[PDB]
Amino acid sequence: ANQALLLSYAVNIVAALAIIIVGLIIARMISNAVNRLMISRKIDATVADFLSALVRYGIIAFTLIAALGRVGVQTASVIAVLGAAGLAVGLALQGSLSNLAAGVLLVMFRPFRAGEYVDLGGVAGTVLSVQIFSTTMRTADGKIIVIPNGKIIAGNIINFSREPVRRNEFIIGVAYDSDIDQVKQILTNIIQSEDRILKDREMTVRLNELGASSINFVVRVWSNSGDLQNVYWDVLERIKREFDAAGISFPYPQMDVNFKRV
Amino acid sequence: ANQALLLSYAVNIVAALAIIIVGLIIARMISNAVNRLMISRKIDATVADFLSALVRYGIIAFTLIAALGRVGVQTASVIAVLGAAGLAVGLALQGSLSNLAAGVLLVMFRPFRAGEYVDLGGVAGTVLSVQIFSTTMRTADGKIIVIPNGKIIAGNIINFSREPVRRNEFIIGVAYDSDIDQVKQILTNIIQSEDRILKDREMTVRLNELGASSINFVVRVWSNSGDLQNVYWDVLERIKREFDAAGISFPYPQMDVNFKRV
Amino acid sequence: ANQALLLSYAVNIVAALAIIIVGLIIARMISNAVNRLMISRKIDATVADFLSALVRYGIIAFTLIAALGRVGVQTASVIAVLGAAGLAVGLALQGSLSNLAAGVLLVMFRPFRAGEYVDLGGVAGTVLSVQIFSTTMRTADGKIIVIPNGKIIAGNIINFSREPVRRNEFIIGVAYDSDIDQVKQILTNIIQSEDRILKDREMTVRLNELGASSINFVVRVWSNSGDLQNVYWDVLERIKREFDAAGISFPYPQMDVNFKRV
Amino acid sequence: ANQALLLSYAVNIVAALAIIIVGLIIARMISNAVNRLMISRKIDATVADFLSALVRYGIIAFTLIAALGRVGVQTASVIAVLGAAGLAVGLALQGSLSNLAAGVLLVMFRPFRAGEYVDLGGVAGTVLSVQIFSTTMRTADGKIIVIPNGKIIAGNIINFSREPVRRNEFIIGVAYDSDIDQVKQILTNIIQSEDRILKDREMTVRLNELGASSINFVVRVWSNSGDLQNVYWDVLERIKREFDAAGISFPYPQMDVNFKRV
């Protein structure tokens, strides 16, 4: 019935609620101002949202410490409990944070961009988009692959499309009795008559290996990246036709058999 | 017999029990209110339950600190003991927390959905459901596979079903003496007469490799994802029948044998 | 000989021993009450025992801090020493704690149950029991395998027994000159006359591959999981007998030999 | 020459030495009492020695803090230095602690016991003893293998000896022209006349595969674990003899050769 204490306790609860409200307002205002200030300085929008969220949650933590102190909770208790809750949220969000930073780095440095054909860690396909946590790519046969961004930046990135010009390599195996000069001359005429092969680049035509059943010639020629596959197919069909017309044999696997009738 | 101290000790125990009861009530009320507030803001229900549990356990920690302080335990002692107990519970729950966050991300971004055929880290099957800690899938032969969610989001996700259209590839090997133009013409007629092959897509028919015993042709054609397997089977049987009717040989493995009767 | 201090020191030692005794009693009582309260709420018994042990050891830590403070040890010293001892015990018990939580999750979500045939990380067998730290399984040839629970929940779980119906697949290779329609008709009659094959499921019989020495047909049929192996054996023996009666050849490996007598 | 301070300093040094001596005595006494109390409660002796060592070193830490405080070292300094020394000793002893806990678990749950034949992580042999840090096993050819206990409990444990009964499997390949009923009848008579094969268990004799050069029959029969190898050898020799007597051929690798004299 002695209300002098009950009024003080209710007034402390009201002061705590008022501190909570004013602190949430001030946190939203200051975080929005810092976000607009970072966006005006051409900071990346994701980095700006991340730092603004950190500012907002820090001001809210100051507010919670002040209010819970008004209702008698000690500062060490609030700091320990907020640290435990933040550690739990951080353990939950750790992988997403790694993927988020990786996606910012991928958009910032552009090791690849949408439309390029890439090989990310052994999967290969055309990049479709880099998103907040993962990259989507479409394989040559139309499957969709989703890869987390952190796994992408942690590994090698092979970009098939970045270079305008790329090299074909042919390995032609001919019979051991084939005339070497005739083979080199025919392959040279074939790659010389192909307009899509760049003549200012290397145009290797060399005997390369003495194989088990055949001698292997290597042909290396450069082309624009959009012509590479068609040049490979056209040159291969021309090699087949010209070697057939010239009598140069493509050998079947060979075997000397030393007969013994026991 | 001097009860002035015993009454003070019993009154402190009663005050501690009252603080415990009122704190549990306030924790349940505030956590339920924060949960309803998050659900009204369209926060995901699992994220809302997680943050509400954090709020409830934090208020209960404040309550325990106040009560145990009433019975003479120091604030540093309660904080150290609650931190040890929370570290033990967190070590127990760490993997479940990772799987829980991963399941929220899988439901939120939908790299796959129920009914799609996917390949998650080398196992492949039709997704049945994403659950709180793990995803269930059924393989093509009817086995059930359970995969933890964190393992899924940490790896590549190959979605066979997301794209409406997908590509078949045939590798046909024919004898070296086969006429190349006749082979290409027959394969072109076969894929031209198949209505389920999309004519506005690529329809590759090229000589692709000079193999050991055969020259390999590659055929690449696109179809709707529901037609892919049936188109593969029908085109393959037609290739067999047409090549038999045209006299184009499918070669057995070849071997030149250079006989020597020693 | 001035005993006024010695009596105070002995009385402090007696007060410390009394605090130890009363604290152990209160810890046992409160932990038993919390355990019964959790068991009444249908909490899993292992989770209840774990949380009750945490409550008991925390109350004992408060008791030790109070008693050692009575004998003059400072609160920071007791907290540091108990933290070191708890860190040592936690390093000793870390793997057991992971296995314990994993076993609770396995019993709770039942990815598999006793009697089911499963494949856990490359070992396969019939589950016998999930125990507190490890699962026992018996392989098909009668070996016993013990697997820690944490290793099980961290990996893929392939359950062969969960689905009532499962699919057989046959790969039959026949000679290239075999009549395709006759082969498909014979295989269709065989799987049509088998009562244990489910006729409402897929019943694939397709030419599948042009192999090196043979054309391979694929047969896919569904059966109840208890009939799968017997259906495989019966259908395979019938395929052998019917193909022998019809004259359809199973080819030996083939080789074209181009003879050259040098 | 004013000795009033020098006497106080010497008396503080003497008080520190006395606190050290009395604390070492009390630590040894209390740790021995706690050890006897744990051994009386049937706690495992290694666990009891570990917890007793923790109690002894904790009491010695309290003693060192009190004594070094008597000679003017601050409590925070002693706690930081003892924490650094304990962290160094713990880094040195971490792997031994893991092996010690693993050895306690191995002795407690007996996944294997001495004399059993086991496969621990790809090495296999007869267990000789589980020791404090590592297990010794002897391989079939007499090599000794020492494995750390933590590596053992972290992996799969395959116990060949735990089950009284185990299964043999034979894969017999016979010529394609062999009569299937005659082969099954001969194998059935062989396993029917073998007394060490358990007749109440499965006795599979089925055609299992159409191989490249042969049709493979599978025979599966159960025996007592001590009879398994002898039953395998006896049944295999009987299969060889009976198939020779019946004219059933064991095929050499086959090859159809399509001759072409070019």
Add this chain to the structure above:
Amino acid sequence: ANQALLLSYAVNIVAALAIIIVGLIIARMISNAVNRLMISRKIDATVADFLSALVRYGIIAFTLIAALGRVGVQTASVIAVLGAAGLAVGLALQGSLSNLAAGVLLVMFRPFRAGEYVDLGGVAGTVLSVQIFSTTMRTADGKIIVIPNGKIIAGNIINFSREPVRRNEFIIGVAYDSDIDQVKQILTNIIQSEDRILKDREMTVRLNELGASSINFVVRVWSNSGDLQNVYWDVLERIKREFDAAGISFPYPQMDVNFKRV
């Protein structure tokens, strides 16, 4: 209406804003001065920017602590909140920090430089540039590979271009009946007449292996790194021509066939 407190609160807010402004100014000035001082001492520019950023953010942290103390936030609260925000930013930036330090080390010690052909962890190509977080290289066929710097310095670095002189190795297989002295003499004449082979280096020509179908000779010769591939091709073609002119046979795979007409 009693404004004596409201004026004090507004004056504290103004003092906090003034401390913020002056602290940001002083932080920018001191960090710029420390950066110019480090650049004058020939510290690497990236290391200087990193340490200057650390100095600037530390002075800003002191400023925030002072200002938030002026508005009543406690020093422990500001330190805990800034530590949580810095831990979040550090978890986001950890991989970038590792790549940044690795790039500084790569530029500083030059294990490779732009234009050199290197093999970094199994990918090989010509280095194009070392950048702040990753290295770019172009493969021999024109693909671009991006590798994070930390992955590069953590692994082996094989530099094909650092040494002016490099060794070719030929493995020539000849028939078993070939005269060994004639083979060694022909190979010696070939490598003796090649001007691009360094005569002061090793010029090995030895029988090296008795293979299955042939005896293998090893030839090892050194050349300038720019001549290595051309010397390999020229010597190989000369070996083919000279062995053909001398009648030394390159053997096909051999097989003794013990005929048995059963």
Add this chain to the structure above:
Amino acid sequence: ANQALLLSYAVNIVAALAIIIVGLIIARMISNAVNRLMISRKIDATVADFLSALVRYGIIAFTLIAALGRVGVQTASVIAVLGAAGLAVGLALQGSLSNLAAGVLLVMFRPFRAGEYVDLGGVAGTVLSVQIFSTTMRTADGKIIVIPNGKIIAGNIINFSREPVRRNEFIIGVAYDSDIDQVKQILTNIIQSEDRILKDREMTVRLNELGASSINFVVRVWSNSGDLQNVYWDVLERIKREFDAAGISFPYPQMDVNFKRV
């Protein structure tokens, strides 16, 4: 010119230097005494040196705290700086500490000793010495291998030399038409006449496998470890000679060829 303060500051510097000197002396004395006390108790010398170094550095830390407090540095500052320096030294020394503890364990438990032939993680050789951080072994062909001690104790240790007796195993393949009883009788006579084979051990001679071209017999016999290789060589040469004298064939790889002249 008012020297009353300057004298106090110089006297504090002198007191700090005196505390440093006396503390270094006391640290050396106490650490030497503790080292001699541990060596007298038969503690291993490396463990004694490690604990003595910990005692010495801890006393030096107390000395530094007292002296730097005399010159006005606060205890928290000295503890934080010494903790940072000790963390840096510990990060530098962590791997060496692991190897040091592992070497103590290897010398203490003797899984192997100098002169024994062992297999440590896939490398095999004769142990030469266990040193403070690594073990040296010489391979059979004379290469020296250095292995860090921690890598050794973390893995399996296969000791070829610990057991006096070891088992040879022969796999002899004979023609399918060979008489089984004659083969077993000849192998039994061979191993019966060899004095270095232990007759009280197992002397297995069983048909073991029906191979592709041969039936394989297994022979298992025990010998003293010093006789194992010589017994293997002598028994193998005797098997060759006796099977040649008895007409038992060692088969060449077999092939049934079904000729077809197309």
Add this chain to the structure above:
Amino acid sequence: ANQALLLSYAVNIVAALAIIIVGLIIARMISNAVNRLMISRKIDATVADFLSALVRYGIIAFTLIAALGRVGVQTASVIAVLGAAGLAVGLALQGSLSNLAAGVLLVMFRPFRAGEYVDLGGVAGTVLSVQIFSTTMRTADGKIIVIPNGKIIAGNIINFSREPVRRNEFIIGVAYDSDIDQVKQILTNIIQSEDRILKDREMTVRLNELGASSINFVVRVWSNSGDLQNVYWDVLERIKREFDAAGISFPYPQMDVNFKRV
């Protein structure tokens, strides 16, 4: 206009700058003295530079704490900010610190030295130098390999050059009909007439294996490390010549062909 406070603030700033200057001077002096003292005690120069840098930065930290305290920053704030900056620098320098300690250990214990041929983790070459962070080696074909020191000390180190004497091993396969005594006698005469083979070492010449097409003899002989390759080549050529002169056949791969004209 009341300058009594402004003068006090300026005097505190001047006192902070003076403390900074005097502290930098004292830090440089004390660190140089400790470095000279360690170098005089034959401490390794890198270890001395590391510990001197730690001493210098610790004294600078004490100086910064005192100065920033003079300008009103609290000790806890300076310690937290310096700890964050030191944690950032330590995360940047962690891998370099591991490589630095590893390089000190490599120079100190000399598992290898410059000029020796070693195999470090699967790459092999002649060591050129051990540097502060990485080791350089040149491969046999002249490529340069850079390996971080920590990766080297963490793995096996195979030293080909440390032992003066090393063993060659020959595996000679001869025809099954070859006389065993004649083969052993010829190989024994060959290795007996070779002066560079050490006659006091093992000189094994034993039949070793009954292979598919040949019986394999093993020859093992020791030589000085500089003679090993030349002895291998000379003995191999002599084996070829002597076996040709004696009529001992080197077999081609064998095949029994059981002809069947179907």
